Amino acid sequence: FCGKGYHLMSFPQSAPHGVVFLHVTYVPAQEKNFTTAPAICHDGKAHFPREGVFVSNGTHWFVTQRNFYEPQIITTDNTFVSGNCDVVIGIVNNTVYDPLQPELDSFK
Amino acid sequence: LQPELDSFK
Amino acid sequence: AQKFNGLTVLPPLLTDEMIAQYTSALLAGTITSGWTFGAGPALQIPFPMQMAYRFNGIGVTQNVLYENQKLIANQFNSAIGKIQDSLSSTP
Ligand SMILES: *[C@@H]1O[C@H](CO)[C@@H](O[C@@H]2O[C@H](CO)[C@@H](O)[C@H](O)[C@H]2NC(C)=O)[C@H](O)[C@H]1NC(C)=O
Ligand SMILES: *[C@@H]1O[C@H](CO)[C@@H](O[C@@H]2O[C@H](CO)[C@@H](O)[C@H](O)[C@H]2NC(C)=O)[C@H](O)[C@H]1NC(C)=O
Ligand SMILES: *[C@@H]1O[C@H](CO)[C@@H](O)[C@H](O)[C@H]1NC(C)=O
Ligand SMILES: *[C@@H]1O[C@H](CO)[C@@H](O)[C@H](O)[C@H]1NC(C)=O
């Protein structure tokens, strides 16, 4: 409706009996393919990320956002839990990292 | 946070 | 639909075959691209991944789909299957 793609905002300009529009528009470029999965099994429960998916760059399983290849480590703060490992299809085995246990154990 | 603080460490 | 007394019918400049091909291209792009073909270059997203996004777009999580995949597929195929009987039995 504004531009061709993902609109951001617009510039209005004048004509003698009309109007002309300018539309800054987000278009993706330089796309790559990866291996995706809907869920990750760890300790007998199904894990799902906060606002992304599970991706892997061939070996190591990552959490990235939808519109960019910005990977992150699978941790318990960007990933919530629902259900068990059985009822969901597409789930493979990996680990979800704990950001509290080294600070609990090796220091205090 | 309290069960792993108490029962494990 | 007659041709007499100075009135003359003109044929369509784009006939029905390329109209069917444009609608087929629309359905193919939306079955194997998501919304990405409607914005820029088409991107490869699976259809249960896309329907999980559209469930996430409507405000429910993934576990109403991935725990209910065969049920959603049964409801979807039964829902599209009664489209033909609704149009064929209603003039
Ligand atoms: C996939 O991503 C991983 C994680 O970044 C890459 O592994 C790194 O490889 C470099 C070079 O060997 C090492 O110095 C790093 O220590 C590795 N990271 C970790 C966390 O161990 C890997 O290279 C990427 N590509 C492939 C093909 O697996
Ligand atoms: C993911 O990991 C679990 C945990 O090890 C696997 O479950 C085991 O599968 C083997 C193969 O039949 C059994 O012998 C074990 O008894 C299972 N463990 C338990 C605790 O039941 C599971 O198979 C793995 N999934 C995949 C796809 O590799
Ligand atoms: C990306 O696609 C190529 C073929 O087009 C395939 O060989 C490769 O395995 C894919 N990448 C991943 C991570 O699966
Ligand atoms: C995806 O398709 C392949 C067939 O190439 C099949 O072996 C695999 O089980 C499928 N994965 C799921 C989660 O259904």
Q: Are C34 and A53 in contact (CB under 8 A)?
A: no
Give the DSSP H/E element, type plus range, for residue C22.
helix C16-32
Q: Which atom of ligand 3 is nearest to the CA of A56?
A: 13
Expt. technique: cryo-EM
Contacts of B1 (CB under 8 A, 6+ apart): A100
Q: Are C76 and C55 in contact (CB under 8 A)?
A: no
Residues followed by a break in chain B, C–N over 2.5 Å? none
- The backbone torsions φ and ψ at residue A14, rounded to the nearest 5 degrees and listed phi first, read -100, 150
Q: Which residues of C touch A27 (CB under 8 A)?
A: 39-40
In total, the C-beta contacts within 8 angstroms joining chain A to chain B are 9
Q: Which residues of C touch A50 (CB under 8 A)?
A: none
Question: How far apart are alpha carbons A42 and C80 in whole angstroms?
Answer: 38
Q: Which atom of ligand 2 is nearest to the CA of A91?
A: 27
- Radius of gyration over every alpha carbon of chain A, rounded to an integer in angstroms: 21
Residue ranges lining ligand 3, Cβ < 6 Å: A 33-35, 58
Question: How far apart are alpha carbons A22 and A16 in whole angstroms?
Answer: 17
Contacts of A10 (CB under 8 A, 6+ apart): A2, A3, A21, A22, A23, A24
Question: How far apart are alpha carbons A10 and A52 in whole angstroms?
Answer: 29
Q: Indicate the residue of C46, C49, C67 with minimum beta-carbon distance to A83.
A: C67
Question: How far apart are alpha carbons C43 and A29 in whole angstroms?
Answer: 10
SS3 C72: helix
Neighbouring subunits of C (3+ Cβ pairs under 8 A): A
Check residue C31 and report its DSSP letter: H
Question: How far apart are alpha carbons A61 and A68 in whole angstroms?
Answer: 16
Contacts of A5 (CB under 8 A, 6+ apart): A25, A26, A27, C39, C40
Paired strand residues for A14: A19
* C63 touches A at CB < 8 Å: yes
Of A36, A38, A34, nearest to A91 by C-alpha is: A38
